[PDB]
Design brief:
Chain A: Belongs to the protein kinase superfamily. TKL Ser/Thr protein kinase family. The structure holds 2 chains of a larger assembly. Chain A is of the alpha+beta class. Chain A contains ten helices and nine strands. Chain B has two domains: 87 residues, 2-Layer Sandwich (Phosphorylase Kinase, domain 1), CATH 3.30.200; 199 residues, Transferase(Phosphotransferase), domain 1 (Orthogonal Bundle). The relative contact order of chain B is 0.12. The chains are: A alpha+beta, B alpha+beta.
């Protein structure tokens, strides 16, 4: 990809200040005239199978456009150096948004934000793209509008170590039991069983955050979280411990369902969110 | 606190040697060789240049917002108040390059994990003494500063050729625990069954960790899953099934043919799943195995230096 193969007309785009690092390259702010987000990756693997899948997923993301999904614009690959360019999201992460004192969530606003997220995920699923990293920090809220970011990105195989693991707590809260059981040192993220059902479980966690403005499990040693999540015990005890409303809690129990196959689709979840207060 | 005079005079010697070295910064030090790495950090034998002393420096690498970085350094300076013949000599803590460094005693023989791999197995005679040392350290810690250790395992028991035993890397800072230390999971687990299910835990969890460690050192193998019957005469599993074993299966036990009742019973009491019924430290201190080994006569330093090849 030499960036001229994309439908967004581009003469030149300039890097601006960085705005965070992570397992997948460094994210800068930039100017396409419009602001954009530019993610810089480098490919250790250097095997052309990895670049083949990268090409596959990046042209798959071209086919997407939806008002609740961040606009994928471009990607260029001068291997080992690669760049992914999406539209820049003004406003605040839903994560820092529910955690604000001044913010006023209510039985209506939560359902509305949730329905936005559900429409976005439903689109992504229809085109057969799995997010694999839906979480509160990957949803943006600017006035009325809600946008999902950072989708499909876990499928790639660039530089990220040791034969131990380091797992942030915020992330593991969004992980379904199928996944955390497979975690073990020396296992890469690409071999884990992400899926549509795991995505609706992660939606369960973001809805709980909409209710309680916090994690469902208080910060603790990661081994503890792995056991509590993959045993299903921890999520049963949270459903026990402080409750919300019956119809509210039904969606949570459905999304967090231990057996993945009993988890609802996103189309169904739209209906469930409709028949509410 | 039953502070011996031998002990108080090597405690005095290193607190007054502590102000002789004074204060601290990166280029005062100089590398020697690779001590090791774990849980997000590497530690190296170092020479401080103002003071010819050889120390051990712990560097761990944490880019985060500076406010909590300084909360961490100020919470960690309490290590200056923590001083017992059974807790590593602490000297200083500082921020440099966004890499926290802790300067501590160098321990000639390293960790009982290191000791163990070369030694293969650790005799019972000697595990008595290390057990006494650990209960003393944990009680000192619980009574004097009201903390718990939270990370007891053989790689955190340190030995020297002068024959002392002390514990390193105890959980002194809450901020460093919540912001970094929690996120790591290794290939083995020493966590109690009540910590794994996320209830409130206590020093009881540390009793459990110590019991599992004593089994590992006594038989030379990480004890769960229990060795198979033929594997026992001679002397591939993911992390979740390990944790699920720890929570849902009987605990390890020492083999009945080889070690005394007193040892078998000590460890059996450390490894009871219900922390209410697990021995506390008051009870462990007066246990038969302890009364025996405390009054025994073992020359530890000799065993250590002929074990590893020091002098
Ligand atoms: N389209 C975007 N608009 C605005 N900010 C963005 C956009 N995409 C990513 N970011 C920001 O990029 C930063 C880092 O994102 P990211 O690299 O994905 O790290 P992370 O989500 O915090 N955890 P990880 O996915 O492991 O890196 C965060 O501050 C995001 O808010
Ligand atoms: N003061 C010390 N003197 C000598 N060796 C030390 C000292 N402190 C640590 N070590 C060695 O450093 C290595 C790893 O230390 P460490 O950073 O504690 O990792 P770990 O014990 O495996 N996990 P953790 O203690 O929870 O961070 C081990 O081989 C120890 O023997
Ligand atoms: Mg992300
Ligand atoms: Mg240690």
């Amino acid at each position: 990809v030499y960036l001229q193969e994309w439908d967004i007309p581009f003469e030149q785009v300039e890097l601006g200040e960085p705005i965070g690092q992570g397992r997948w390259g460094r994210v800068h702010r930039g100017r396409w005239h419009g602001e954009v987000a530019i993610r810089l990756l480098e490919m250790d693997g250097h095997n052309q199978d990895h670049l083949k899948l990268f090409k596959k997923e990046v042209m798959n993301y071209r086919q997407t456009r939806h008002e609740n999904v961040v606009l994928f614009m471009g990607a260029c690959m001068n291997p080992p150096h690669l760049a992914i360019i999406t539209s820049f999201c003004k406003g605040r992460t839903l994560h820092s948004f529910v955690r604000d004192p001044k913010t006023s969530l209510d039985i209506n606003k939560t359902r509305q934000i949730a329905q936005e997220i559900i429409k976005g995920m439903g689109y992504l699923h229809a085109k057969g793209i799995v997010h694999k990293d839906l979480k509160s920090k990957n949803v943006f809220y600017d006035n009325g509008k809600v946008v999902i970011t950072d989708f499909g990105l876990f499928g790639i195989s660039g530089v990220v170590r040791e034969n131990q693991l380091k797992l942030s707590h915020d992330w593991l809260c969004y992980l379904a039991p199928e996944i955390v059981r497979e975690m073990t040192p020396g296992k890469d993220e690409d071999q884990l069983p992400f899926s549509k059902a795991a995505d609706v479980y992660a939606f369960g966690t973001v809805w709980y955050e909409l209710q309680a403005r916090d994690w469902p499990l208080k910060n603790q040693a990661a081994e503890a979280s792995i056991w509590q999540i993959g045993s299903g015990e921890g999520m049963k005890r949270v459903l026990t411990s402080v409750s919300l409303g019956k119809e509210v809690s039904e969606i949570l129990s459905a999304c967090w369902a231990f057996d993945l196959q009993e988890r609802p689709s996103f189309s169904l979840l739209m209906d469930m969110l409709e028949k509410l207060p | 606190l039953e502070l011996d005079e031998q002990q108080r005079k090597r405690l005095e010697a290193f607190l007054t040697q502590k102000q002789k070295v004074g204060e601290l910064k990166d280029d005062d030090f100089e590398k020697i060789s690779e001590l090791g790495a774990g849980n997000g950090g590497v530690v190296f034998k170092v020479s401080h240049k103002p003071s010819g002393l050889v120390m051990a420096r712990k560097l761990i690498h944490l880019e985060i917002k500076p406010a909590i970085r300084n909360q961490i350094i100020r919470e960690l300076q309490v290590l200056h108040e923590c001083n017992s013949p059974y807790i590593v000599g602490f000297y200083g803590a500082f921020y440099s390059d966004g890499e926290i460094s802790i300067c501590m005693e160098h321990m000639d023989g390293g960790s009982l994990d290191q000791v163990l791999k070369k030694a293969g197995r650790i005799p019972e005679q000697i595990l008595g003494k290390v057990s006494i040392a650990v209960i003393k350290g944990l009680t000192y810690l619980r009574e004097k500063h009201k903390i718990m250790h939270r990370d007891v395992k053989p790689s955190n028991i340190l030995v020297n050729s002068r024959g002392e035993i002390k514990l390193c890397d105890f959980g002194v800072s809450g901020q460093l625990i919540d912001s970094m230390a929690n996120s790591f999971v290794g290939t083995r687990s020493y966590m109690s069954p009540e910590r794994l299910q996320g209830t409130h835990y206590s020093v009881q969890s540390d009793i459990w960790s110590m019991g599992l460690s004593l089994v590992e050192m006594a038989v030379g193998r990480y004890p769960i899953p229990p060795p198979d019957a033929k594997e026992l005469e001679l002397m591939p599993m993911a992390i979740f099934e390990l944790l699920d074993y720890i929570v849902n299966e009987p605990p390890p036990k020492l083999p009945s043919a080889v070690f005394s009742l007193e040892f078998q019973d000590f460890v059996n009491k450390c490894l009871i799943k219900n922390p209410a019924e697990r021995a506390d430290l008051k009870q462990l201190m007066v246990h038969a195995f302890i009364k025996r080994s405390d009054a025994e006569e073992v020359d530890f330093a000799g065993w250590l230096c002929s074990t590893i090849g020091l002098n």
